[PDB]
Amino acid sequence: QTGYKSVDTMIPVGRGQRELIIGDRQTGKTAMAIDAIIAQKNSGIKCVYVAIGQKQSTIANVVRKLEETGAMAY
Amino acid sequence: SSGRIIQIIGAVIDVEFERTSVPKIYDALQVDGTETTLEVQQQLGDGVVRTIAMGSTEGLKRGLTVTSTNAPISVPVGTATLGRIMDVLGRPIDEAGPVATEERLPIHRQAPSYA
Amino acid sequence: SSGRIIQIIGAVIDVEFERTSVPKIYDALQVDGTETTLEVQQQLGDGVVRTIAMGSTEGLKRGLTVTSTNAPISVPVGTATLGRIMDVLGRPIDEAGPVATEERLPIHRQAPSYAEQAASTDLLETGIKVIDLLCPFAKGGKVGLFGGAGVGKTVNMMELINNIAKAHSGLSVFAGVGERTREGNDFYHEMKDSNVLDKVAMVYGQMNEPPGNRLRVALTGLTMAEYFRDEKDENGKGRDVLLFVDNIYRYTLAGTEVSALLGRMPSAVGYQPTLAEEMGVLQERITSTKSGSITSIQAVYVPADDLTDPSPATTFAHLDATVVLSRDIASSGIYPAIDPLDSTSRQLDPLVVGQEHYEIARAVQNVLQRYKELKDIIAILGMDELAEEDKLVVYRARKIQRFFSQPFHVAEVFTGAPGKLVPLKETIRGFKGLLAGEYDHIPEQAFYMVGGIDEVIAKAEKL
Amino acid sequence: QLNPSEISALIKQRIGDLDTSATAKNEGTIVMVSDGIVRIHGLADAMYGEMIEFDGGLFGMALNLEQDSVGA
Amino acid sequence: ELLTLARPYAKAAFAYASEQGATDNWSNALQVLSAAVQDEAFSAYLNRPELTPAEQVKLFAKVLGEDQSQAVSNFLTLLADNDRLVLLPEIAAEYEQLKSQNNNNVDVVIESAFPLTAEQEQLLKSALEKRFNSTVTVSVEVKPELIAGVVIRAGDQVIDDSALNKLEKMRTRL
Ligand SMILES: Nc1ncnc2c1ncn2[C@@H]1O[C@H](COP(=O)(O)OP(=O)(O)OP(=O)(O)O)[C@@H](O)[C@H]1O
Ligand SMILES: [Mg+2]
């Protein structure tokens, strides 16, 4: 589950897929991924993130957001 | 002790040193003749090192001696630098005489940690 | 007289030998430490050779001894492989125990000679509406499947598999070439529940191995198909066999990968200059012969739906039909979901298909393409403002689209897995009547998800 | 001639210290350094992807295996 | 290639030694150093990265013993500077070529199935003299795996009497 009506309806995702997100810059791809993570709060499955080529401030911001949701416990 | 030029192209220069002492990857180098300083770039090995120019490239001849400082570029720092205009080496150009600070800090350092 | 590891960079390997003892090209080299094997690519003088690693690229130590076989790569073949899945080396990867036969044959034979071309062109029918009407096949042909991601393409191939198996003792074979192993496993299990593996042989290259392996799986499948065709049974003529290419583009890319590291200079796109050489080598060993024939199906991928660059260009000069799948026809609920207007074959010819079938195909092309171009104005105004002419055309086109809806024989679960395999002649009859208008008085739904006129009329009467 | 030449080589130089006792196959010499790229003399024993330790205590990655040097 | 790289050095060395007649001494030194570089041990010791050109030069002087010269040392120095030490034997070979052509001598290599007697060898030397060369350098070779006859190679020039004739007849029949 991804929370996004369009995503959850038109192009689903199943446990084990290799789906890809693509687009131009500042398009919430970061945000979309984060929301995807949030959605699995109640799934019981686990979630892992990697940061590449980004200012540490960005990463710390993201981490703080996750803790604000408490998601950074699974 | 000292090294000397092998080749000159544009702003990139090479120095030959004894295997006993070869400069570290970033160090200030004093052309022992005219007024020019050099910054170490690569450890070309076998006593060979590659560098970049900090002034004009002229008067320089293949073989002229040059020394190391064993220290990278460090410029004056502090309030005494404020209200002043210094060069890329911290030398004044505003004709306000030398800067009255002796604190020195290198131009290279590590990125701040995540923590 | 054993060679040693002298230099390794990524995928290219080099070995020293005693100058008297020099391996020939394309012969296997035995890593004396591991089971990994090396194929000669070129001889570097002084007893130095260049090779590619068949197997893992781990455990490698500069100065490790390696031996040869002084013979090309040969793998076992014969009926003792049917329903078994092998590696690039012909080893059991299905954990079903070792292979039973010792009949081992090399993989680099030459293309069949000119004098031994099948002296006459042939034809193949599939019992499928759009194909047998608009995509005829010659036994020994070359078929391309372009695009298609909202539908089960593997379902289509498996339908063709059941087609040929029930149609002929001619067995089938598939090769995994950069296989999306999810789909490969799905296909494996679905053929399994079909209980049809006795006419099938499996080799997989699954995007996880050095480029040579995925290059050479094609040769493996080729060799299996060749030998199996060559088994002349009780008559002096063996069965005509069928091949499945997981993707030709990945075959191109396999060589494309390490070409530059081989010292090869780039090509017009940066590609390998030996592109056409290997391509022809591949295709020319796929033909129809004086005794027996071999044909194949090639699952084609297109980069960014662009055809105007060499990678599909070279391929096209070897196919015989361009089956281009259609997405929104699937959105129209059509089972086969194959475009009826872009797919063609060079086999559309009156001399080979007769005149009547050819001209029916002509007429249906015309009516469908004319209906397409009226879509806009119909949307703008409506059917009424068009002349009474072409209203029947619209109805006939819609009924044609319905008629194309063919329930699948083998899905096991799509509509009950009902086979149609209607004769070409019956479909000719039906489409002739529809073009004439024999039934241009019935809702198109009666033509939907059915086969011949008998089914259409029965459906129309039951409702 | 050939073998006499070899013996004379062993004569004018005895063993050459066994070439520093096979030059310590477990020792790698720092040769060429530029932009995080390390060239190493010796160390014939190498995997494609060894962990490479140093006097500084840090680590490198074994990537390029050459006839003469090592790219890390 | 490698021979191409070696060319100019051979020219220089030959010119100088001829101008000093010490050509024999340089040839002997060349053989010595070629054998030297052939040694894996000697090379590996030489290619140790902690050695300036002086180290390698003096090492070559030592292994040469009391045979070197100032011209020899200069030559070694220049080659060490560009590290062309590797392709030395080819330089020596070309140098031999130069002395042979200069003295107009031609070196001839002959393989026979059976070993030969000096009578026949002298006869062949005379015969190739009738082939109008100045002088000849004969190197014989027993090759009993060859069916019979003597095969003679003068550079690109070859003459056959052995199994090759048979190969020719078979290709002819086909
Ligand atoms: N669904 C949404 N609703 C409202 N705002 C959104 C939504 N998705 C993204 N945004 C906004 O878009 C802004 C920029 O997007 P973002 O920075 O996440 O893109 P990005 O994937 O990080 O791209 P880049 O990697 O180039 O930085 C964010 O500040 C966020 O507030
Ligand atoms: Mg981002």
The domain segmentation of chain C, as residue ranges, is 1-72, 73-347, 348-463
> Which backbone phi and psi does D23 adopt, to 5 degrees?
55, 40
Q: Is C104 helix (H, G, I), strand (E, B) or coil?
A: strand
State how far the Cα of E146 lies from the Cα of B31, in Å rounded to an integer: 72
Residues 6+ apart with CB under 8 A from B25: B40, B41, B42, B43, D33
State how far the Cα of C8 lies from the Cα of C16, in Å rounded to an integer: 12
State how far the Cα of C459 lies from the Cα of C73, in Å rounded to an integer: 58
Which amino acid type is present at position C315? Answer: T
CA distances (Å), origin C275, targets C22, C175, C178: 28, 20, 18
Find out whether B1 and B47 touch, Cβ atoms under 8 Å: no
Residue C321: alpha-carbon gap to chain centroid: 11
C226 assigned to active site: no
Find out whether C433 and C407 touch, Cβ atoms under 8 Å: no
Find out whether B76 and B102 touch, Cβ atoms under 8 Å: yes
State how far the Cα of C455 lies from the Cα of C426, in Å rounded to an integer: 12
Pairing of strands C321-324, C172-177: unpaired
Burial of C46 (0-12, 13-18, 19+ CB in 10 A): exposed
Ligand 1 centroid to Cα of residue A27, in Å, is: 5
State how far the Cα of C144 lies from the Cα of C307, in Å rounded to an integer: 13
Q: What is the DSSP letter of C247?
A: -
State how far the Cα of B24 lies from the Cα of D33, in Å rounded to an integer: 11
Find out whether E57 and E76 touch, Cβ atoms under 8 Å: yes
CB atoms inside a 10 Å sphere around CB C127 = 20
**Two tokens at E64?**
């040469």
Counting ligands in written order, the one closest to the CA of A28 is 1
State how far the Cα of C158 lies from the Cα of C146, in Å rounded to an integer: 17
Ligand 2 centroid to Cα of residue A16, in Å, is: 23
State how far the Cα of B92 lies from the Cα of B82, in Å rounded to an integer: 11
> Which backbone phi and psi does C443 adopt, to 5 degrees?
-60, 140
Q: Among C197, C198, C223, C210, which residue's Cα sits nearest to residue C75?
A: C223
CA distances (Å), origin C243, targets C1, C73, C287, C297, C401: 41, 21, 12, 6, 30
Q: In degrees, to the nearest 5, what angle opens at C-alpha E133 toward C-alphas E130 and E134?
A: 115
Residues 6+ apart with CB under 8 A from C315: C144, C248, C249, C252, C279, C298, C300
Q: Which of residues 59-78 of C touch D (CB under 8 A)?
A: 59-63
C372 assigned to active site: no
Find out whether C343 and C164 touch, Cβ atoms under 8 Å: no
Q: What share of chain B is helix, strand, coil (3-state, %, to 5)?
A: 5, 40, 60
Find out whether C67 and C2 touch, Cβ atoms under 8 Å: yes
**Two tokens at C327?**
């997405």
Q: Which atom of ligand 1 is nearest to the CA of A4?
A: 1
Residues 6+ apart with CB under 8 A from E124: E110, E138, E150, E152
State how far the Cα of B52 lies from the Cα of B74, in Å rounded to an integer: 17
Give the domain range for residue D41: 1-72
Inspect the interface and report whether the beta carbons of B19 and E49 lie closer than 8 Å: no
Which amino acid type is present at position C333? Answer: G
Q: Among B4, B23, B25, which residue's Cα sits nearest to residue B69?
A: B23
Sign of CA dihedral C385, C390, C394, C399: positive
The residue written with tokens 């090592």 in the block is D70
CB atoms inside a 10 Å sphere around CB E71 = 16
State how far the Cα of C213 lies from the Cα of C292, in Å rounded to an integer: 29
Region label for E97, one of left (φ > 0), alpha (ψ between -120 and 50) or beta (otherwise) = alpha
Q: Crossing angle for the helix pair E2-20 and E23-38, nearest 10 degrees?
A: 150
State how far the Cα of C444 lies from the Cα of C433, in Å rounded to an integer: 14
State how far the Cα of E21 lies from the Cα of C405, in Å rounded to an integer: 98
The residue written with tokens 């150009």 in the block is B93
CA distances (Å), origin C317, targets C112, C141, C280: 18, 13, 10
Which residue puts its alpha carbon closest to atom 29 of ligand 1?
Answer: A28
Find out whether C412 and C418 touch, Cβ atoms under 8 Å: no
Q: Is B101 helix (H, G, I), strand (E, B) or coil?
A: coil
Resolution (A): 4.3
Find out whether E33 and E64 touch, Cβ atoms under 8 Å: yes
Rg of the Cα trace of chain D? 16
Ligand 2 centroid to Cα of residue A22, in Å, is: 11
State how far the Cα of B88 lies from the Cα of B53, in Å rounded to an integer: 12
For residue C59, list chain D residues with Cβ-Cβ distance below 8 A. 47
C399 assigned to active site: no
By C-alpha distance, the chain B residue nearest E81 is: B46
Burial of B40 (0-12, 13-18, 19+ CB in 10 A): buried
Residues 6+ apart with CB under 8 A from B107: B72, B73, B74, B75
State how far the Cα of E81 lies from the Cα of B55, in Å rounded to an integer: 31
**C270 marked as part of a ligand binding site:** no
Find out whether C312 and C145 touch, Cβ atoms under 8 Å: no
State how far the Cα of E31 lies from the Cα of D36, in Å rounded to an integer: 43
Residues 6+ apart with CB under 8 A from B110: none
CA distances (Å), origin C40, targets C51, C135, C210: 5, 42, 15
State how far the Cα of C433 lies from the Cα of C208, in Å rounded to an integer: 53
**Two tokens at E118?**
């000096």
Q: CB of A31 closer than 6 A to ligand 1?
A: yes
Counting ligands in written order, the one closest to the CA of A50 is 2
State how far the Cα of C124 lies from the Cα of C430, in Å rounded to an integer: 20
State how far the Cα of C286 lies from the Cα of C253, in Å rounded to an integer: 20
Q: Among B77, A2, A19, which residue's Cα sits nearest to residue C182?
A: A19
Question: Can you give chain E as a three-state secondary structure string?
Answer: CHHHHHHHHHHHHHHHHHHHCCHHHHHHHHHHHHHHHHCHHHHHHHCCCCCCHHHHHHHHHHHHCCCCCHHHHHHHHHHHHHCHHHHHHHHHHHHHHHHHHHCCEEEEEEEECCCCCHHHHHHHHHHHHHCCCCEEEEEEEECCCCCCCEEEEECCEEECCCCHHHHHHHHHHC
What count of residues does chain C have? 463
State how far the Cα of C162 lies from the Cα of C139, in Å rounded to an integer: 16
H or E segment and range at residue B76: strand B74-76
Burial of E106 (0-12, 13-18, 19+ CB in 10 A): middle
Q: What residues have a C-beta under 5 A from ligand 2, the ion?
A: A 30
Pure H helices in C265-318? 275-284, 310-316
Testing ligand 1's pocket by substitution, the residue of A6, A20, A27 carrying the most ligand atoms inside 8 A of its CB is A27
By C-alpha distance, the chain B residue nearest D40 is: B45
Inspect the interface and report whether the beta carbons of D32 and B43 lie closer than 8 Å: yes
Catalytic residue among C4, C180, C285, C346: C180
Buried b (16+ CB within 10 A) or exposed e, A32-48: bebebbbbeeeeeeebe
Q: Is C281 helix (H, G, I), strand (E, B) or coil?
A: helix
**C51 marked as part of a ligand binding site:** no
Catalytic residue among C39, C159, C179, C455: C179
State how far the Cα of C284 lies from the Cα of C290, in Å rounded to an integer: 15
Pairing of strands E105-112, E150-154: antiparallel
Q: Among C10, C3, C14, C1, which residue's Cα sits nearest to residue C49?
A: C14
Testing ligand 1's pocket by substitution, the residue of A5, A7, A29 carrying the most ligand atoms inside 8 A of its CB is A29
Q: How many structural domains compose chain D?
A: 1
State how far the Cα of B15 lies from the Cα of B2, in Å rounded to an integer: 9
Question: Can you give C364-388 as a three-state secondary structure string?
Answer: HHHHHHHHHHCHHHHHHCCCCCCCC
Find out whether C166 and C419 touch, Cβ atoms under 8 Å: no
Q: Among C366, C390, C368, C361, which residue's Cα sits nearest to residue C378?
A: C390
**Two tokens at C325?**
């799948």
Inspect the interface and report whether the beta carbons of B46 and E50 lie closer than 8 Å: no
Please report, to the nearest 10 degrees, the dihedral formed by the alpha carbons of residues C116, C120, C125, C129 taken in order.
120
Report the CATH architecture of E2-100: Orthogonal Bundle (1.10)
**Two tokens at C258?**
């390490």
Q: What is the CATH number of the domain that holds D26?
A: 2.40.30.20
**Two tokens at C65?**
């001894």
**Two tokens at C184?**
């490969």
State how far the Cα of C91 lies from the Cα of C78, in Å rounded to an integer: 14
Residue C321, beta-bridge partner list: C143, C345
Buried b (16+ CB within 10 A) or exposed e, D9-45: beeebeebeebeeebeeeebbebbeeeeebbbbbbee
State how far the Cα of C253 lies from the Cα of C215, in Å rounded to an integer: 8
Q: What share of chain A is helix, strand, coil (3-state, %, to 5)?
A: 45, 0, 55
Q: CB of A51 closer than 6 A to ligand 1?
A: no
Q: Is B45's Cβ below 8 Å from some Cβ in D?
A: yes
Burial of A66 (0-12, 13-18, 19+ CB in 10 A): middle
Find out whether E9 and E79 touch, Cβ atoms under 8 Å: yes
CB atoms inside a 10 Å sphere around CB B107 = 13
Buried b (16+ CB within 10 A) or exposed e, C147-165: bbeebbbbbbbbbbbbbbb
State how far the Cα of C453 lies from the Cα of C431, in Å rounded to an integer: 9
Find out whether C204 and C184 touch, Cβ atoms under 8 Å: yes
By C-alpha distance, the chain A residue nearest B111 is: A56
State how far the Cα of B53 lies from the Cα of B35, in Å rounded to an integer: 11
State how far the Cα of D60 lies from the Cα of D49, in Å rounded to an integer: 9
Find out whether C126 and C135 touch, Cβ atoms under 8 Å: no
Inspect the interface and report whether the beta carbons of C9 and D44 lie closer than 8 Å: no
State how far the Cα of C223 lies from the Cα of C22, in Å rounded to an integer: 27
Residue ranges with strand state E in C44-171: 48-54, 65-72, 74-76, 85-86, 104-106, 142-146
By C-alpha distance, the chain D residue nearest C57 is: D48
State how far the Cα of C282 lies from the Cα of C216, in Å rounded to an integer: 11
State how far the Cα of E142 lies from the Cα of B23, in Å rounded to an integer: 62
CA distance B7 to chain E (A): 16
